[PDB]
Every structure is written in structure tokens, then in C-alpha cells.
Design a protein around this ligand. Structure first.
Ligand SMILES: Cc1oc(-c2ccccc2)nc1COc1cccc(CO)c1
Length: 297
């Protein structure tokens, strides 16, 4: 996924005509990119109008950002379809218009915002639309599934967080990446030096700047904390600086979130192990959360 200029674009399969795509109101805006809500006619089903999310650039973007987006398109094609990864539906790449990457619409938006909104409507055990402990383990399991899939397609995420998990209908959650559609300069999550999501980054990524599937496992552990604090921000009160990293470098971890179970907090700790090889794989995380899901019901 770092050598994606060699990956094909099959236009006869993926090209969607711009005149069958009707753009609506923006869902997220960054500095160079945006995600737009749209209506797409017959994109996945014959003569069927479907709501979709369109990822594209905006005023300020250059040829450089255009290449990056074309890369994200090619990677999504390569990766292929999976329930818990935001599915590609088509693209407008023809000259005379902007590069548009057309993906699934996820009604309920990002998982961080959504979980926050459900603090009032939560009960561990079951209330028509109330979240439960089961819902939370289920989300965790789904994301682990999606990440196992991505890992097996020889690529890594690099920005795994609740804000990059979307919630569709019927409790399906999907891994995505807003990328340039997120305003990293005005988002508190991205601390200044490049703007990096330091609270989700593993020590070797902070100090040595090494990105691996195992550093995503670390980030998954932080996502678990977000899920089981119902969308709270990680390391509350604590300010992210040079002396915040040294504490992590010698084993200071977050306390248990308000809604966790003992096993779930232990799973966060496993993910936050110092040695990258000592962290569980996503294959192991899928089996383990599957067990915990069964133990809950
Ligand atoms: C094109 C696109 O649009 C959105 C998106 C669509 C709508 C809203 C927010 C984001 N997510 C993606 C990609 O999601 C990914 C999944 C796995 C791996 C990678 C690459 O590491 C990317």
C-alpha cells in the first residue's frame, strides 16, 4: 500500500458517469479534501437510487493531493469487499471533472460522536434503542475483523481511532479514513509535530516513526478504550507533550474506562504491551473478542 502506483484501475468496472451522480450537503471538510453526501443512480443495483458518500478534493488542494486520492482509490480496489471496511462502489476519474471516490453511506456517522450521544441511553444488560455491553463487544469484534482483513491484504491503516469508525444500519461498523476530509489543524486530536494523532500512536511510531500492523494493534487498544468509555477522549486532563511520551516509554497506561469489563481492560493492556511482537495479532483478537461476545450472551 506504499507502492500503489503499480496497482491497476479497471475503468470498465469502476467508472461511474458523473451525470448519474447528484451531490448534496457536505458531511466533513478538511483543508484540501471533503466528504459529500450524494444520491447515485443504479451504482450497485439496476435502476436503484442509493444514498452514498463521495470523497473528493476541494479549494486549496493541488496535483499532489489528487495523486494521493487516486492512490486511496487503487488501494480500495485492491483490498476488495468486506462487511467491516467501508466499501467502494465506483469512481469518477474522467477528465473535465474532479476525482470522486464513491463509498457506502453510513447513516449514524463516526463512532466517537455516536457513543457520546448514547451516554443517556445505555444499560449493561437488557430500552428500545439502548446500547448494551453486548453492542460494545460486538463493535470491538467487528473492527478487529475488519483489521484482520486489511492485514491479510498486506496493508495497514496508520490512523485507527473511533473517529475513523463509522456506524451503518443494523449495528454494522466500518473502518474508514477521512484523511484530507478531516481538518487536522483545528482538530485537538492531532497535536503539532506534521499533525499527528499522538494519543493513538505506539511508542516506536512516536520515537522511531515505524509503521507496522502491530502498531495498529496498539491503536486498536486505544479504540477499545474509546468504545468502553462511550466516546470519551483518551488520556483525560493529561496534556500531550515531550514528557507524556517518556511515561509511555516506561509503562504508564490509562486507567480503566467507566463501562469496561475486567477481561476487556486486560485486552487493552495486551494491545499496549511494550514489545510489538508481544502484542496479540488481529487474528488472535478476533477469536478472543468472539469468545467474550459468547460469554456475554
Ligand atoms: C476513500 C475512503 O473514503 C472514506 C470515507 C468515506 C466517508 C466518510 C469518511 C471516510 N474512507 C476511505 C478509505 O477507507 C479505508 C479503509 C481501509 C484502508 C484505507 C487505506 O488505508 C482506507
Amino acid at each position: 500500500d506504499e507502492h500503489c502506483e503499480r496497482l491497476p484501475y479497471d475503468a470498465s468496472k469502476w467508472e461511474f458517469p458523473r451525470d448519474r451522480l447528484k451531490l448534496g450537503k457536505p458531511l466533513g471538510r478538511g483543508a484540501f479534501g471533503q466528504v459529500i453526501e450524494a444520491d447515485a443512480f443504479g451504482i450497485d443495483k439496476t435502476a436503484t437510487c442509493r444514498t452514498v458518500a463521495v470523497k473528493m478534493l476541494k479549494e486549496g488542494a493541488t496535483h499532489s493531493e489528487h495523486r494521493a486520492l487516486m492512490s486511496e482509490l487503487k488501494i480500495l480496489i485492491h483490498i476488495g469487499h468486506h462487511l467491516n471496511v467501508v466499501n467502494l462502489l465506483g469512481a469518477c476519474t474522467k477528465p473535465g471533472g474532479p476525482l470522486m471516490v464513491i463509498v457506502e453511506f453510513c447513516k449514524f456517522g463516526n463512532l466517537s460522536t455516536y457513543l457520546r450521544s448514547k451516554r443517556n441511553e445505555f444499560v449493561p444488560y437488557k430500552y428500545k434503542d439502548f446500547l448494551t455491553l453486548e453492542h460494545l463487544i460486538c463493535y470491538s469484534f467487528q473492527v478487529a475483523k475488519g483489521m484482520e482483513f486489511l492485514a491479510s491484504r498486506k496493508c495497514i491503516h496508520r490512523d485507527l481511532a473511533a473517529r475513523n469508525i463509522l456506524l451503518s444500519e443494523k449495528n454494522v461498523v466500518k473502518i474508514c479514513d477521512f484523511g484530507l476530509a478531516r481538518d487536522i489543524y483545528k482538530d485537538p486530536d492531532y497535536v503539532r509535530k506534521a499533525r499527528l494523532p499522538l494519543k493513538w500512536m505506539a511508542p516506536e511510531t512516536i520515537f522511531d516513526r515505524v509503521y507496522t500492523i502491530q502498531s495498529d494493534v496498539w491503536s486498536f487498544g486505544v479504540l477499545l478504550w474509546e468504545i468502553f468509555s462511550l466516546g470519551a477522549s483518551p488520556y483525560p486532563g493529561v496534556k500531550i507533550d515531550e514528557e507524556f511520551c517518556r511515561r509511555l516509554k516506561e509503562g504508564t497506561r490509562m486507567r480503566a474506562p467507566d463501562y469496561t469489563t475486567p477481561e476487556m481492560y486486560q485486552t487493552m493492556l495486551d494491545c499496549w504491551h511494550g514489545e510489538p511482537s508481544q502484542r496479540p495479532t488481529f487474528s488472535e483478537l478476533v477469536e478472543h473478542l468472539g469468545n467474550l461476545l459468547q460469554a456475554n450472551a
